[PDB]
Amino acid sequence: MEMEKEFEQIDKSGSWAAIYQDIRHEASDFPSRVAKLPKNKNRNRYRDVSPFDHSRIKLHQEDNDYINASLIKMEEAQRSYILTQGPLPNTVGHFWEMVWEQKSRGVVMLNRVMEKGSLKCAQYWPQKEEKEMIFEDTNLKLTLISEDIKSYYTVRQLELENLTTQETREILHFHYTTWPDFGVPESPASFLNFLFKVRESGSLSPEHGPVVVHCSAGIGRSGTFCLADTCLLLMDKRKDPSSVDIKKVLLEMRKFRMGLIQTADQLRFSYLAVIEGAKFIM
Ligand SMILES: C[C@@H](O)CNC(=S)N[C@H]1C[C@H]2CC[C@@H]1C2
């Protein structure tokens, strides 16, 4: 079926939970043996969210190459994304090591450091120009260059220096600051405006390594971001945009990381975002 009318048909019939449970039943199951090794327990935020072995990102280190991060490679859309958990106190250096080694231009953050009165990820970037951060375990330096605070999101320019080679690179930090502590946004308008800002920066384009996207677990809000982007790109590329099947695209993405889209409300929000986004594109 088309999307917008499939949408109203699920609303009128109130069957979002049944649609979402079908997706969960059909999703891929692949091994995640490296994630479950005992030496990696303090590298995982949640025991039930792990990268598959076949698609995990490897650090270029011979001691321990493990990080909780997956490469989602979308062949028809010609987009790649790295989805990862919010960094932990003992993985902030690994996180920036990955950004460096994978040649990413942009980092997309969809959570606040504290939500619901608890810590959802480490404070992994500097908040003042004159107070830079040094990660001694991976030999990197990170400096805040500039910061632009808007009503729904903040953009930061950062300098990442590899202290071993003295090479430097400019990294863009796109921080969506207004996702509600509970539920999903009422309108997708500000999320779509944010996605377009990331696109306009060049961070999603083939002349750079894959964008790094995270929330707390790296599967819920993060899944919404890449699902909406890929679906909109396919609607632009194909002769018949109504052929784009968001449930099929989601199942393809779940071949590369488990659990993408965590609730039926996130599924409905993803439909809403693609539907509204397709009207603005034209
Ligand atoms: C006519 C409908 O079945 C549309 N099919 C779609 S959108 N397939 C997608 C799933 C993954 C593999 C191919 C694309 C990305």
Short mmCIF file of C-alpha atoms and ligand atoms in Angstrom, two decimals:
data_model
loop_
_atom_site.label_atom_id
_atom_site.label_comp_id
_atom_site.label_asym_id
_atom_site.label_seq_id
_atom_site.Cartn_x
_atom_site.Cartn_y
_atom_site.Cartn_z
CA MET A 1 0.00 0.00 0.00
CA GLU A 2 1.00 3.65 -0.25
CA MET A 3 2.24 5.29 2.93
CA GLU A 4 -0.15 8.14 3.80
CA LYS A 5 -3.26 6.00 3.39
CA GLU A 6 -1.78 2.93 5.02
CA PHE A 7 -1.11 5.43 7.83
CA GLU A 8 -4.73 6.54 8.23
CA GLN A 9 -5.86 2.92 7.96
CA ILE A 10 -3.68 1.95 10.94
CA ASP A 11 -4.84 4.98 12.93
CA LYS A 12 -8.53 4.29 12.32
CA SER A 13 -8.05 0.59 13.13
CA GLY A 14 -5.74 1.27 16.10
CA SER A 15 -3.32 -1.51 15.14
CA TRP A 16 0.10 0.15 15.59
CA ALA A 17 1.11 -2.36 18.27
CA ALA A 18 0.27 -5.30 15.99
CA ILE A 19 2.18 -3.84 13.03
CA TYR A 20 5.19 -3.17 15.26
CA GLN A 21 5.13 -6.68 16.76
CA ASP A 22 5.14 -8.17 13.25
CA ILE A 23 8.37 -6.26 12.54
CA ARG A 24 9.91 -7.58 15.76
CA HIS A 25 8.94 -11.15 14.82
CA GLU A 26 10.42 -10.93 11.30
CA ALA A 27 13.66 -9.14 12.22
CA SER A 28 17.05 -10.74 11.65
CA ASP A 29 18.95 -12.57 14.37
CA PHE A 30 22.72 -12.77 13.92
CA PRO A 31 25.44 -13.57 16.45
CA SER A 32 26.99 -10.91 18.72
CA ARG A 33 29.71 -13.05 20.32
CA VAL A 34 32.39 -10.36 20.61
CA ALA A 35 30.01 -8.02 22.48
CA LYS A 36 29.34 -10.70 25.11
CA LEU A 37 32.96 -11.55 25.98
CA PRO A 38 33.62 -10.88 29.70
CA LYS A 39 36.43 -8.40 28.99
CA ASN A 40 33.85 -6.14 27.25
CA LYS A 41 31.24 -5.89 30.02
CA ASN A 42 32.16 -2.29 30.90
CA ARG A 43 32.03 -1.31 27.18
CA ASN A 44 28.26 -1.94 26.94
CA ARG A 45 25.64 0.36 28.39
CA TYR A 46 22.75 -2.15 28.16
CA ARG A 47 23.08 -5.93 28.31
CA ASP A 48 20.30 -6.46 25.74
CA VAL A 49 21.70 -4.03 23.07
CA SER A 50 24.73 -5.40 21.22
CA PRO A 51 26.24 -5.00 17.73
CA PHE A 52 26.17 -8.03 15.43
CA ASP A 53 29.60 -9.50 14.72
CA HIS A 54 29.21 -9.21 10.95
CA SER A 55 28.56 -5.44 10.94
CA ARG A 56 30.35 -4.13 14.05
CA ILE A 57 32.92 -1.31 13.83
CA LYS A 58 36.43 -2.44 14.77
CA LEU A 59 38.88 -0.11 16.49
CA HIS A 60 42.40 -0.14 14.96
CA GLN A 61 43.98 -1.46 18.12
CA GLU A 62 45.45 -4.91 18.70
CA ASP A 63 44.70 -5.22 22.43
CA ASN A 64 40.91 -4.85 22.25
CA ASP A 65 39.15 -3.74 19.07
CA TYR A 66 35.60 -3.67 20.53
CA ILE A 67 33.11 -0.80 20.54
CA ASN A 68 29.30 -0.95 20.70
CA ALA A 69 28.78 0.46 17.18
CA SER A 70 27.37 -0.89 13.86
CA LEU A 71 27.77 0.04 10.16
CA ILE A 72 24.34 0.34 8.46
CA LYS A 73 25.07 0.22 4.68
CA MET A 74 22.05 1.10 2.45
CA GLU A 75 22.88 -0.06 -1.09
CA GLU A 76 20.04 1.35 -3.21
CA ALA A 77 19.99 4.69 -1.38
CA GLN A 78 23.82 4.95 -1.46
CA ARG A 79 24.05 6.10 2.17
CA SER A 80 26.01 4.65 5.10
CA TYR A 81 25.57 5.39 8.82
CA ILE A 82 27.37 4.32 12.01
CA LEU A 83 24.90 3.84 14.90
CA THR A 84 26.38 3.66 18.41
CA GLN A 85 25.39 3.97 22.07
CA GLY A 86 25.99 7.12 24.07
CA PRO A 87 29.61 6.98 25.27
CA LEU A 88 30.37 5.67 28.78
CA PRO A 89 33.03 7.05 31.16
CA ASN A 90 35.39 4.29 30.05
CA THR A 91 34.63 4.54 26.29
CA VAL A 92 34.87 8.29 25.49
CA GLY A 93 38.38 7.77 24.09
CA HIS A 94 37.25 4.79 21.97
CA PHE A 95 34.39 6.92 20.60
CA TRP A 96 36.72 9.64 19.28
CA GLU A 97 39.17 6.99 18.08
CA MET A 98 36.32 5.61 15.92
CA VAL A 99 35.37 9.07 14.59
CA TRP A 100 39.03 9.57 13.56
CA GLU A 101 39.62 6.11 12.01
CA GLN A 102 36.34 6.08 10.03
CA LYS A 103 36.96 9.65 8.68
CA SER A 104 33.55 10.91 9.78
CA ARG A 105 32.72 14.60 9.36
CA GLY A 106 29.66 14.79 11.61
CA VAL A 107 28.37 13.44 14.94
CA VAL A 108 24.59 13.43 15.48
CA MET A 109 23.35 13.38 19.15
CA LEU A 110 19.62 12.87 19.84
CA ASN A 111 19.57 12.83 23.69
CA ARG A 112 20.48 15.10 26.63
CA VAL A 113 23.26 14.07 29.02
CA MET A 114 20.67 13.88 31.83
CA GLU A 115 17.07 12.73 31.22
CA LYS A 116 14.47 11.50 33.74
CA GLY A 117 16.94 12.45 36.51
CA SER A 118 19.61 9.90 35.41
CA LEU A 119 22.73 10.03 33.26
CA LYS A 120 22.12 8.86 29.67
CA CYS A 121 25.69 9.40 28.37
CA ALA A 122 29.02 10.90 29.39
CA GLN A 123 29.90 14.58 28.90
CA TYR A 124 32.18 13.66 25.99
CA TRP A 125 32.91 17.08 24.41
CA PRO A 126 34.29 20.35 25.86
CA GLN A 127 31.91 23.09 26.95
CA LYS A 128 34.37 26.03 26.94
CA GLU A 129 36.91 27.05 24.26
CA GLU A 130 39.76 27.47 26.71
CA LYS A 131 39.21 24.05 28.45
CA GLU A 132 40.10 21.38 25.88
CA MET A 133 39.88 17.61 26.48
CA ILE A 134 42.71 15.10 26.20
CA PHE A 135 41.98 11.35 25.89
CA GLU A 136 45.22 9.72 27.00
CA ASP A 137 44.25 6.10 26.28
CA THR A 138 43.78 6.88 22.54
CA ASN A 139 46.12 9.93 22.20
CA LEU A 140 43.58 12.47 20.93
CA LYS A 141 42.87 16.13 21.71
CA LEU A 142 39.45 17.77 21.32
CA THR A 143 38.78 21.56 21.33
CA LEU A 144 35.53 23.53 21.15
CA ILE A 145 35.88 26.07 18.29
CA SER A 146 32.37 27.61 18.16
CA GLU A 147 28.81 26.92 19.26
CA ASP A 148 25.46 28.06 17.78
CA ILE A 149 22.46 27.50 20.10
CA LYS A 150 19.01 27.47 18.50
CA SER A 151 15.57 26.74 19.91
CA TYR A 152 15.44 23.02 19.04
CA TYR A 153 19.09 22.12 18.43
CA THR A 154 22.69 23.26 18.82
CA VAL A 155 25.54 23.03 16.26
CA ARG A 156 29.14 22.96 17.42
CA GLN A 157 32.41 23.14 15.54
CA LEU A 158 35.11 20.94 17.10
CA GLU A 159 38.80 20.34 16.33
CA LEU A 160 40.05 16.76 16.72
CA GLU A 161 43.84 16.33 16.74
CA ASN A 162 45.68 13.02 16.47
CA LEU A 163 48.53 13.71 18.89
CA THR A 164 50.68 10.93 17.39
CA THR A 165 50.81 12.56 13.92
CA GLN A 166 49.77 16.16 14.74
CA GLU A 167 47.10 15.92 12.03
CA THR A 168 43.92 17.90 12.74
CA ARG A 169 40.34 17.72 11.45
CA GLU A 170 37.15 19.73 11.79
CA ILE A 171 34.16 17.75 13.22
CA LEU A 172 30.57 19.07 13.28
CA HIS A 173 28.41 18.21 16.36
CA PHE A 174 24.66 18.29 15.62
CA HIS A 175 22.77 18.12 18.93
CA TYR A 176 18.98 17.74 18.91
CA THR A 177 18.09 19.03 22.37
CA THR A 178 14.27 18.91 22.59
CA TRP A 179 13.16 15.26 22.25
CA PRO A 180 10.76 14.77 25.21
CA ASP A 181 11.73 12.69 28.26
CA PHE A 182 8.67 10.47 27.55
CA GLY A 183 7.01 9.59 24.24
CA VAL A 184 7.76 11.24 20.86
CA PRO A 185 7.35 14.80 19.52
CA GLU A 186 3.83 15.88 18.61
CA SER A 187 4.92 17.32 15.24
CA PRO A 188 7.87 16.10 13.11
CA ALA A 189 8.58 19.61 11.86
CA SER A 190 11.60 20.40 14.06
CA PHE A 191 13.12 16.91 13.61
CA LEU A 192 12.87 17.31 9.81
CA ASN A 193 14.39 20.80 9.97
CA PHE A 194 17.27 19.26 11.95
CA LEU A 195 17.76 16.43 9.42
CA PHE A 196 17.95 18.98 6.59
CA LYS A 197 20.58 20.97 8.50
CA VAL A 198 22.73 17.85 8.89
CA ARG A 199 22.33 17.14 5.15
CA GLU A 200 23.25 20.69 4.13
CA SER A 201 26.55 20.45 6.05
CA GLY A 202 27.97 17.65 3.88
CA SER A 203 28.15 15.20 6.81
CA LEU A 204 25.97 12.57 5.07
CA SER A 205 27.70 12.79 1.69
CA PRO A 206 30.00 10.24 0.00
CA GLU A 207 33.13 12.43 0.16
CA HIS A 208 33.29 11.73 3.93
CA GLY A 209 33.25 8.63 6.11
CA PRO A 210 29.85 7.64 7.57
CA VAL A 211 28.11 9.98 9.98
CA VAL A 212 28.14 8.77 13.61
CA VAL A 213 24.63 8.86 15.19
CA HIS A 214 23.70 8.10 18.80
CA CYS A 215 21.14 8.44 21.53
CA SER A 216 21.35 6.51 24.80
CA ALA A 217 21.19 2.93 23.41
CA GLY A 218 21.71 3.81 19.73
CA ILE A 219 18.59 2.06 18.37
CA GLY A 220 15.49 4.13 19.10
CA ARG A 221 15.75 7.85 18.26
CA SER A 222 18.87 6.92 16.26
CA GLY A 223 16.85 4.45 14.18
CA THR A 224 14.20 7.07 13.52
CA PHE A 225 16.87 9.45 12.13
CA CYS A 226 18.38 7.06 9.56
CA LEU A 227 15.05 5.45 8.58
CA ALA A 228 13.53 8.85 7.73
CA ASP A 229 16.62 10.00 5.82
CA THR A 230 16.88 6.80 3.69
CA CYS A 231 13.14 6.70 2.92
CA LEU A 232 13.11 10.33 1.71
CA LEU A 233 16.21 9.74 -0.47
CA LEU A 234 14.58 6.68 -2.10
CA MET A 235 11.42 8.71 -2.82
CA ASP A 236 13.61 11.20 -4.74
CA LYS A 237 15.55 8.54 -6.68
CA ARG A 238 12.70 6.25 -7.86
CA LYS A 239 10.28 6.71 -10.75
CA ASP A 240 7.37 5.79 -8.44
CA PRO A 241 7.81 7.32 -4.95
CA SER A 242 4.72 5.51 -3.64
CA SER A 243 6.66 2.24 -4.02
CA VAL A 244 8.81 3.07 -0.98
CA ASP A 245 7.80 0.66 1.80
CA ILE A 246 8.95 1.97 5.19
CA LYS A 247 8.45 -1.40 6.91
CA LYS A 248 10.69 -3.11 4.35
CA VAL A 249 13.37 -0.43 4.68
CA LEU A 250 13.31 -0.87 8.48
CA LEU A 251 13.68 -4.64 8.19
CA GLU A 252 16.65 -4.16 5.83
CA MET A 253 18.30 -1.80 8.36
CA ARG A 254 17.69 -4.35 11.15
CA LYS A 255 19.96 -6.77 9.25
CA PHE A 256 22.81 -4.49 10.45
CA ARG A 257 21.81 -3.53 14.04
CA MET A 258 19.21 -5.08 16.34
CA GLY A 259 16.19 -3.28 17.76
CA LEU A 260 15.98 -0.20 15.54
CA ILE A 261 12.77 1.65 16.47
CA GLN A 262 11.98 0.73 20.08
CA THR A 263 8.22 1.39 20.39
CA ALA A 264 5.06 1.53 18.26
CA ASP A 265 4.96 5.28 18.96
CA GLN A 266 8.42 5.65 17.39
CA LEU A 267 7.18 3.66 14.36
CA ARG A 268 4.17 5.97 13.93
CA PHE A 269 6.40 9.03 14.32
CA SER A 270 8.71 7.71 11.59
CA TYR A 271 5.74 7.39 9.19
CA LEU A 272 4.63 10.92 10.08
CA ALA A 273 8.10 12.33 9.46
CA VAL A 274 8.48 10.71 6.04
CA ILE A 275 4.96 11.73 4.98
CA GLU A 276 5.42 15.40 5.87
CA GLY A 277 8.97 15.46 4.63
CA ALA A 278 7.98 14.24 1.17
CA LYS A 279 5.71 17.30 0.68
CA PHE A 280 8.39 19.80 1.56
CA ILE A 281 10.94 18.23 -0.77
CA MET A 282 8.84 19.27 -3.77
C1 LIG B 1 7.63 -2.32 -3.83
C2 LIG B 1 8.14 -2.40 -2.34
O1 LIG B 1 8.47 -3.79 -1.98
C3 LIG B 1 9.40 -1.51 -2.01
N1 LIG B 1 10.61 -2.20 -1.64
C4 LIG B 1 11.65 -1.66 -0.89
S1 LIG B 1 11.49 -0.09 -0.39
N2 LIG B 1 12.75 -2.30 -0.61
C5 LIG B 1 13.83 -1.84 0.17
C6 LIG B 1 14.35 -2.87 1.32
C7 LIG B 1 15.92 -2.91 1.31
C8 LIG B 1 16.32 -3.71 0.12
C9 LIG B 1 15.70 -2.92 -1.06
C10 LIG B 1 15.17 -1.61 -0.53
C11 LIG B 1 16.20 -1.41 0.77
#
